[PDB]
Amino acid sequence: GRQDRPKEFPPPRYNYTILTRYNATALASPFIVDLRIVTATRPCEMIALIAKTNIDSILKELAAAQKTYSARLTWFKIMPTCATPIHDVSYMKCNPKLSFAMCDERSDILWQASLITMAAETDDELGLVLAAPAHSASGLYRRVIEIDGRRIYTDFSVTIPSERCPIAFEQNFGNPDRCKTPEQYSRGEVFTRRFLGEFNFPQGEHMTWLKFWFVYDGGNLPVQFYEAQAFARPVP
Amino acid sequence: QDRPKEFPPPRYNYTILTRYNATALASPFINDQVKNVDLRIVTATRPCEMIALIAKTNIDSILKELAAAQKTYSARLTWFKIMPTCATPIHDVSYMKCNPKLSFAMCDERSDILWQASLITMAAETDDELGLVLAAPAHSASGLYRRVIEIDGRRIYTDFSVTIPSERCPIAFEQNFGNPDRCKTPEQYSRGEVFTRRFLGEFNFPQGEHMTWLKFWFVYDGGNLPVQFYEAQAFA
Ligand SMILES: *[C@@H]1O[C@H](CO)[C@@H](O[C@@H]2O[C@H](CO)[C@@H](O)[C@H](O)[C@H]2NC(C)=O)[C@H](O)[C@H]1NC(C)=O
Ligand SMILES: *[C@@H]1O[C@H](CO)[C@@H](O[C@@H]2O[C@H](CO)[C@@H](O)[C@H](O)[C@H]2NC(C)=O)[C@H](O)[C@H]1NC(C)=O
Ligand SMILES: *[C@@H]1O[C@H](CO)[C@@H](O)[C@H](O)[C@H]1NC(C)=O
Ligand SMILES: [Mg+2]
Ligand SMILES: [Mg+2]
């Protein structure tokens, strides 16, 4: 069945409008937290950075306040001296009675360009799936959710084996053009629109193509994407 | 504004060999035969245009010879931007099991369809797969583009001199074509070190789908879509 390209896709959860012109403010610095563990046990795994957040607490506050809000989602890979934004979306005109990112408007759906065919958001748009990342994708990933000025942080400690994966692709996450120093964030000099590419397919279609491309390359699709576990406190 | 759901039917059903690794890229620097390369002119006079790099070749005469020889054949298509000290490959496809009774690239097999990752959403092949369309390129995309068609060991060259207004296009994206990571010196080519699989990304949509999405995305950004694409005029 791997031959047949898909032609029907899950219907989107909400019909938004993409404001192609919207110039977001400079990125708030990611250098300051809930820590999740993601470790691959084999080469060429499809891994999932998924983690629930007590955010519906915040949206109930906004919903009772009868206030529609703007928000923002950004994924960073954190290096020892810099941080690379790899996925970024701005949201506006959100009804707080709905789920996050079910908003009337949004910026371009922005990605590090070489990630387009190797990554996608999960169904609730808050998680990130990586198809066969290389060993160099090991490290620390930080999800920053911005909702009405407040910021929720989630860290993912990701382990990829060093055995070569024949379908992996080197992402050079630490290249200085995309790996921004703490100063560049502080001076307000980091604008995702300038160096991240757009890919405005809805998540349902992006994910559908990611799975089809991965299996077509010979990957083994997991039965189920699982929430990344919190770091395990020791057992006496 | 409403997303496309019907696409032109493909010219030919082909199989993509995702594992295939082409041999190193032949140097595009043809210092010896600089004088006789078919050179075309392509100029935009307003910002944010969609331009086409189209040029007929004598490829059909080569295909007739192979057809008379009943010779199933291999072939390669590669586009470069030629800078003064290096050359950036920006699109690359290898073709195998080619039936010489058909048109170029109507082949039973091919490699991944490779692009500079940041071009995916801003470029696409034309219907015969030999031309190249750029949607809202920036001023820095001005310059010399060289198309290298390799067929049964033979190589056909077409050069395009492209001019883009200096005024900033608001929907354009900087491609950093001159970056050493992707712009390769003549020595790197001669030493057999340039492997497109290493550093170009894939976009395995058939041309008809890629071209359809390209047009829809351009128009959605407020681009003016030209009535039709024309062959570039020769240097006169
Ligand atoms: C998003 O938009 C689509 C298309 O406008 C909606 O699907 C249509 O919904 C209307 C009203 O119920 C039906 O009459 C049509 O038959 C549906 N299909 C089409 C092709 O128009 C879809 O329900 C919308 N979803 C949300 C969450 O607003
Ligand atoms: C096949 O193409 C790959 C690029 O996708 C080349 O990979 C690198 O080649 C160099 C030199 O041979 C090695 O030092 C690297 O370790 C290779 N990378 C990986 C990820 O293995 C490869 O050289 C090509 N195959 C050849 C030339 O036989
Ligand atoms: C491609 O294959 C489908 C069947 O999967 C067929 O119906 C279609 O006609 C084929 N296209 C061409 C151009 O042969
Ligand atoms: Mg692939
Ligand atoms: Mg756009």
Residue numbers in the entry:
A (entry chain A): 39 to 70, 77 to 280
B (entry chain B): 41 to 276
Q: What is the paper's account of this structure, in its own sentences?
A:
The structures of gD1 and gD4 revealed the existence of a common V-set immunoglobulin-like (IgV-like) core comparable to those of other gD homologs. The cores consist of a nine-stranded (A′, B, C, C′, C″, D, E, F, and G) β-barrel, arranged in a typical V-like Ig fold, flanked by N- and C-terminal extensions with loops, α-helices (α1, α2, α3’, and α3), and small β-strands (str2-4).
The crystal structure of gD1 contains two gD molecules per asymmetric unit. In the crystal structure, two ions interpreted as magnesium are trapped between the molecules forming the dimer which are coordinated by residues E242 and D261 of both protein chains together with water molecules. Therefore, we suppose that gD1 has no dimeric form on the virus envelope. N-linked glycosylations are visible at the predicted sites N53 and N61 which are conserved between gD1 and gD4 but not in gDs of other alphaherpesviruses. Apparent dissociation constants ( Kdapp ) of 7,000 ± 2,000 nM and 5,800 ± 760 nM were calculated for gD1 and gD4, respectively. EHV-1-gDF213A displayed a significant 2-log reduction in growth kinetics and low titers in cell supernatant compared to the parental virus.
